[PDB]
Design a protein around this ligand. Structure first.
Ligand SMILES: CCCCCCCCCCCCC/C=C/[C@H](O)[C@H](N)CO
Ligand SMILES: CCCCCCCCCCCCC/C=C/[C@H](O)[C@H](N)CO
Lengths: 252, 278, 128, 59, 178, 64, 111, 252, 59, 56, 178, 64
């Protein structure tokens, strides 16, 4: 069967038995920066498998009236072992990513999830002409949560699901690399993002590269007696990461 | 020389090949090489599974037994001794042999004989060198009943003489069995009607050893003790078997007190230590 | 039966705890304070018997800080940035006034000898 | 009628020994402590329809 | 649970909060109480040195409608035991998705500085930790039992080796058996 | 009646001084001191002292 | 191995030849606690017996170490936190020897 | 002239104009661990030039009555950038070292230094049967100082120069790789130590590999009017470093 | 399986001895007291840019 | 059999070759053969560094 | 000066009269007190015979403006110790000019009647004397320290050999170390 | 620091490890007594809406 997939990176391995098709990127596979498109002059640090491995983020709980969660991924991996340590000592860095989102239920359950990677998802503010705090955009490994109604918390992101924070129709987010976790048949949420930017290397802290969003379009629904606690676990790997411009320890 | 298998280098993987997902429901041990789940390097490994072979595991001079007898006793029965040959009165070699269900080997046998002057009033003597006789009686032969019995004249029975102070006695013994192999375990009866004696005691049938001092009755008592050391060699073994958990109780059966599986813990998870302080 | 465990000794601030043989009944731990710091109290505890359980025989010791005394004033010259307390490895730099010439090393530093604060050498002098 | 074998020695850095049998019976000989072969395919993998270890081996 | 078949049953159920845990022990196959009296551990207690990798197999013995993911992780020594799921995903882990293949394999490689470790306990040859984490949850339909059981296996790889013949510390005799 | 050592090691070029030459009962940690016999002279690279150890035996004393 | 008859009143005996046992215990094994202990039965531990008057006992021992070489000097600690015991004592780990008379208790002391 | 030498490592470069001969090792140059002498099984981390570069330790002041200073070098580089960070995340590690000791004066000055690298320099305690604290053996990048007379500080090292802490004649320390900084003619203190141990990889914190000692045999001496403050600067580089057994952050 | 070597003898004025190994382990063999090689070039002359000993080797 | 090295004959010298002037500042033991400073004769030396090996 | 680093410091300064001297000792590497506890002397005290030449290296650790010449001399035995500079220049000497190469080598050859000498003291295998002479002076400019220091080294040549294994006379033990 | 108010007690059921103060993103898990059956989600968590602490949903209930 093609429902089974093993993914091996570093000293970490993910096995899935209800994959559908491992979704992977814009057609492009991640690779190291060539020296014909390069800008910086000193020797890069291709560190090892010590960064190119899976890291598990926190789990979010999918209830009957949950709306959606999001992450910012160069910033979410900022305390995840030696990867984050390289972020704190180098000025420029660069990596693709293997995102694998897991979630499981039983056959008596129903509900459908959308898992999108959105490049440059510049969020809009809840009150219009007002600053946004960094803790409301990216909270590290901890997810920020959309709402159903419009939000009006001060110095916060406008969080409605039907506008996705950015101000578009949420059914139009299937233009980005995505999958669905239909609980009837899926768990295979890969998106192997390449490096996507407008410059050959970039700073990990000053720039957010993309945004993972997990939005349930068909909400979770079950009969009385089934397991009511259904977690969603997000695991993320850097691929072909390299670092440049070593100096003192950075901005925590 | 048969070295252990080596570790091959590997890289990243994203495919429908799943070595981790197996079925342990099919009686089958998975053979996952460590180069299939993590990225490894080239390790040329030079280790040899040498001292874990069944010969290198069993061919040590183990034991079986201690035997005591005197050279001047008022009762004529403690002047010599005897021993029906089994390998099941000392637990270490018994457990090691009961790793397997069938065995086939030759035995190298060594005796270690030590004599102690007993307590009496006339304890200051001038005693010459004691000489010992160890006679083996095959299954069915005639048995001695005293130290001056004429059954000790060893015309057909193999016997060994030893003088105090020399190297210990040692002799080799071939595969002395009527079946194709020895039986560590026998699940059956002695009589065809499923009565009688149950277990491995039907198949022992090795004969017995007899021990005396060749000298005449001394003027002061000296007790001698000889330790029979069994040592197997030229070993083959068949249909392996789990190690025994419980303690042995007798030499003629497998009867036990019910012991738990392992040592206990206080909780099902681990953590850092909660003793004294920083 | 099996041995009982004493509680975890934890940490001494500015000191060590050396636990060579575990913390079971009949153990021994030792105590030592760092450089520039002096031990006051106990140097060892035993996991003795106390009531119906096992406890440690001595309480936890303390690491005070060792100071050199006040630095000696030189004739015709001041100290550049004189601090109130001088700990281990710390130095005073002597300046010199206008019309006077230094002789010898500018700076002396603080040492510990026989667990005691002490300056390393004599202070310099300005003649002019 | 002697026979010359190799001695058990270390790796990464072929010494020979000689042997004569003196007695007429084969139970008298010294033990064979130099056979290092093995075949753990009758205890592990003791199945029919031999698996591949990369396939799911079910359905 | 030593005096029952419950020693082999590892509990698993639905949890009201993820980021959790399932179990953990110390990788000492013959010193640790967990895998002491095992087949590998009892072969291994007649020796005094060991080397090579170790396999672990986890058969999920629950319903066919139940599903969930776990974090099976090994942590080489030098730091303490991990206390989060995010500290344990820095190690050598695999994420296990329960499905039609009901068992997975955690392969513990040989990460050492010496060629051999002691089968008894010394501080010089510490070997690491094995923990399993509720990663997401157990998700069941209605009228299906929530509380299920994992069974854990252990064996050795094709590069495993033992070295120094000693007597086992588990045989004990007081008098002759007669 | 504590544990005591033996008489200190008789050297062929040094004798004991005169609190130590008469009195017995050497406990543990006791230091004794030797003087140069007549007619000898001191070697300055050696200290003429002997400590009695835990096993009731003195330290090594060779030629002072 | 040398034996001396100790001092007692009944010093005139007729003693047969003393026999000695030297048992080696590898690191971690079980230790004897008496002369009539059943841990002396040397089924796996290598032990050597000797009778008074013969050539002295001699046996060869291979390179019994867990590292690539022995260490005369070790500049480090036993615990990873740089506590514990310091020096070469962390790496000794050779096991120990045990010595007894194989004979029973005599009527006069011999050391 | 052969008095001039440039040494280039990573993004760091040392130039000397009064070298004599760059001293370098036991004849062996440092190299990565081969896979025929290796023990650990997972892929090593050969990090980059990000560890293989020069780090400058603190300066010690050479006065007229100074006696000697020492360091412990896997432990002295424990806060020196990404090198130290790799020490905190890996269990096993391995490197050679390029030690370059600098010191300068004028031609009216006189005095001579000995610079030795001593493998396994196990120090002895000041009071005999008593423990030594770790802060007295290795104080990080900060030097511990020998004395002239015997020392009796509690839980401290016996620090006499004429026994070098270890209990030998100090004129016999020229059996180890060394140089002299004669102020008449030198500055060229290299010692390119290879990896020296009895195991193919080792722990950086639990084991000290070697000990640098700078002992003046002919003491510093000058006439009145010359510069009285003469510093001594020690710069150290790892070479062919690699790391193994990645886990959580270690022992500070 | 014997081996014949030369005996240690005086100079200025090739006697052979014979050797048989009896045991199966190489730790059992007699010690190798006849290897007289040396190479004191890693302790003496342990430098880079190898000197000539007739030049000044400086400036 | 590895004998010790021999002594070669030499004569008078007046040149810019200076084996005595060395630099002991470079961690380096000088290897002055005795035929470089005095005038020597031919010595065929038959000594063996046998009993100074680490085994012996 | 034994209990200090001053044992290794040989004094040298400017002298008001030439024809002088610096130091001297007796060539006995293991009997003489000077080179007794040296590396060569401690290898050499486990033996009882020695043979071959001996090197001596003199590093002048003074200023770079200082200059001067010395007379490094070896005297084979048979006469007494020389008492002049003109008696010591009849031996095996070299005149050492201090310059940009700050060290020189006095090579002591093998002048004997036997192939071996004893590493201990007997009168039959006396070996000679090593003396160093102020030949001219130490000449320094103004505001430069006059008093400087020579360091002396010792090693062996490529024809050096030792013969009779004995125990060293420096190990001493009274009781077992515990 | 913003706090949600005190969490509502359910009829026939307690709170597993009830904390004194509940900040943002923190949850209370409701248990249930013997002889009673849970209905709905076990746990509710704390939210901020209009800069104000608020629990996310209604607490569950135990019928039996
Ligand atoms: C005069 C000296 C003769 C010594 C005779 C002593 C031993 C003769 C009996 C043969 C020994 C058989 C060894 C044990 C047999 C099997 O292993 C057991 N039944 C275990 O299954
Ligand atoms: C029944 C007879 C067995 C005799 C056993 C006695 C010796 C067995 C232990 C091995 C001896 C090791 C030799 C010493 C080791 C190293 O040289 C030291 N650690 C010094 O570094």
């Amino acid at each position: 069967s093609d429902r089974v997939r093993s993914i091996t990176l570093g000293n970490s391995t993910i096995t899935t038995q209800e994959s559908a098709n491992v979704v992977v990127g814009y057609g492009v596979w991640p690779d190291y920066l060539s020296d014909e498109e390069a800008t910086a002059e000193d020797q890069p640090t291709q560190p090892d498998v010590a960064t190119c491995r899976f890291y598990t983020l926190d789990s979010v709980s999918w209830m009957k009236e949950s709306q959606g969660w999001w992450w910012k991924f160069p910033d979410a991996l900022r305390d995840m072992g030696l990867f984050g340590q390289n972020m704190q000592y180098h000025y420029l860095g660069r990596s693709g990513y293997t995102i694998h989102v897991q979630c499981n239920a039983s056959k008596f359950h129903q509900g459908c999830l959308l898992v999108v990677c959105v490049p440059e998802a510049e969020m809009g503010a809840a009150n219009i002409n007002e600053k946004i705090n960094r803790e409301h955009l990216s909270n590290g490994e901890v997810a920020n949560t959309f709402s159903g109604t419009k939000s009006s918390n001060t110095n916060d992101v406008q969080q409605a699901v039907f506008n996705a924070g950015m101000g578009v129709a949420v059914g139009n987010l299937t233009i980005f690399p995505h999958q669905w976790i239909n609980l009837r048949t899926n768990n295979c949420a890969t998106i192997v993002m390449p490096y996507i930017n407008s410059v050959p290397m970039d700073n990990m802290f000053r720039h957010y590269n993309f945004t993972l969003m997990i939005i349930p379009f068909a909400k979770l629904d079950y009969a009385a007696g089934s397991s009511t606690y259904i977690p969603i676990t997000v695991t993320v790997a850097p691929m072909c990461a390299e670092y440049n411009g070593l100096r003192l320890a950075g901005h925590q | 020389v048969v070295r252990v298998a080596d570790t091959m280098p590997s890289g990243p993987s994203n495919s429908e090949s799943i070595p981790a997902l197996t079925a342990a429901e099919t009686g089958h041990t998975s053979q996952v090489v460590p180069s299939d789940t993590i990225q490894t390097r080239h390790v040329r490994n030079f280790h040899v599974r040498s001292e874990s072979s069944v010969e290198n595991f069993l061919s040590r001079s183990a034991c079986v037994y201690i035997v005591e007898y005197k050279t001047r006793d008022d009762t004529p029965d403690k002047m010599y001794d005897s021993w029906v040959i089994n390998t099941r009165q000392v637990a270490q070699l018994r457990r090691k042999l009961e790793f397997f269900t069938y065995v086939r080997f030759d035995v190298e046998v060594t005796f270690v004989i030590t004599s102690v002057q007993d307590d009496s009033t006339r304890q200051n003597t001038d005693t010459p060198a004691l000489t010992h006789q160890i006679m083996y009686v095959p299954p069915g032969g005639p048995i001695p009943q005293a130290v001056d019995d004429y059954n000790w004249q060893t015309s057909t029975n193999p016997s060994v003489f030893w003088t105090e102070g020399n190297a210990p006695p040692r002799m080799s013994i071939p595969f002395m069995s009527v079946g194709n192999a020895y039986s560590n375990f026998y699940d059956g009866w002695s009589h065809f009607s499923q009565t009688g004696v149950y277990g491995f005691n039907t198949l022992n049938n090795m004969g017995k050893l007899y021990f005396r001092h060749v000298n005449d009755k001394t003027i002061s008592p000296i007790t001698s003790k000889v330790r029979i050391y069994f040592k197997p060699k030229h070993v083959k073994a068949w249909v392996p078997r789990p190690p025994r958990l419980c303690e042995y109780t007798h030499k003629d059966n497998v009867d036990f007190e019910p012991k738990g599986v392992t040592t206990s813990r206080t909780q099902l998870t681990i953590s850092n230590s909660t003793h004294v302080e920083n | 039966c099996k041995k009982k465990s004493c509680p975890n000794p934890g940490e001494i601030r500015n000191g060590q705890i050396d636990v060579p043989g575990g913390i079971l009944f009949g153990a021994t731990i030792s105590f030592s304070c760092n450089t520039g710091y002096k031990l006051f109290g106990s140097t060892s505890s035993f996991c003795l018997i106390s009531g119906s359980s096992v406890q440690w025989s001595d309480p936890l010791p303390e690491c005070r800080e060792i100071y050199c005394p006040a630095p000696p004033q030189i004739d015709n010259g001041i100290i550049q940035g004189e601090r109130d307390h001088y700990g281990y490895r710390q130095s005073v730099t002597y300046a010199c006034n206008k019309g006077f010439t230094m002789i010898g090393e500018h700076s002396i530093y603080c040492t510990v000898n026989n667990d005691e604060g002490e300056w390393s050498g004599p202070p310099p002098e300005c003649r002019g | 009628g002697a026979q010359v074998s190799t001695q058990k020695t270390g790796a990464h850095e072929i010494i020979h020994y000689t042997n004569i049998n003196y007695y007429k019976d084969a139970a008298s000989n010294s033990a064979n402590r130099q056979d290092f072969t093995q075949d753990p395919g009758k205890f592990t993998e003791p199945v029919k329809d031999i698996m591949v270890k990369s396939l799911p081996a079910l359905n | 649970n030593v005096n029952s078949l419950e020693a082999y049953r590892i509990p698993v159920h639905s949890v009201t909060e993820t980021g959790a845990q399932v179990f953990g022990f110390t990788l000492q196959p013959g010193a640790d109480t967990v895998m002491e009296r095992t087949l590998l551990g009892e072969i291994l207690n007649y020796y005094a040195n060991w080397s090579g990798s170790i396999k672990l197999t986890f058969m999920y013995c629950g319903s066919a409608m139940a599903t969930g993911k776990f974090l099976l992780a090994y942590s080489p020594p030098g730091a303490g035991v991990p206390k989060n799921r995010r500290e344990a995903m820095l190690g050598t882990h695999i994420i296990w998705d329960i499905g039609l293949q009901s068992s997975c394999v955690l392969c513990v490689p040989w990460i050492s500085q010496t060629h051999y470790r002691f089968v008894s306990k010394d501080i010089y040859t510490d070997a690491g930790f094995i923990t399993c984490w509720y990663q997401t949850s157990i998700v069941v339909p209605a009228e299906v039992q929530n509380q299920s059981v994992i069974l854990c296996f252990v064996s050795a790889c094709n590069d495993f080796s033992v070295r120094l013949l000693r007597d086992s510390p588990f045989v004990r005799q007081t008098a002759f058996y007669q | 009646c504590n544990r005591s050592c033996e008489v200190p090691t008789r050297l062929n070029s040094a004798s004991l001084k005169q609190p130590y030459i008469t009195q017995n009962y050497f406990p543990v940690g006791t230091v004794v001191e030797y003087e140069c016999r007549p007619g000898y002279r001191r070697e300055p690279s050696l200290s003429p002292k002997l400590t009695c150890l835990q096993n009731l035996k003195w330290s090594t004393a060779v030629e002072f």
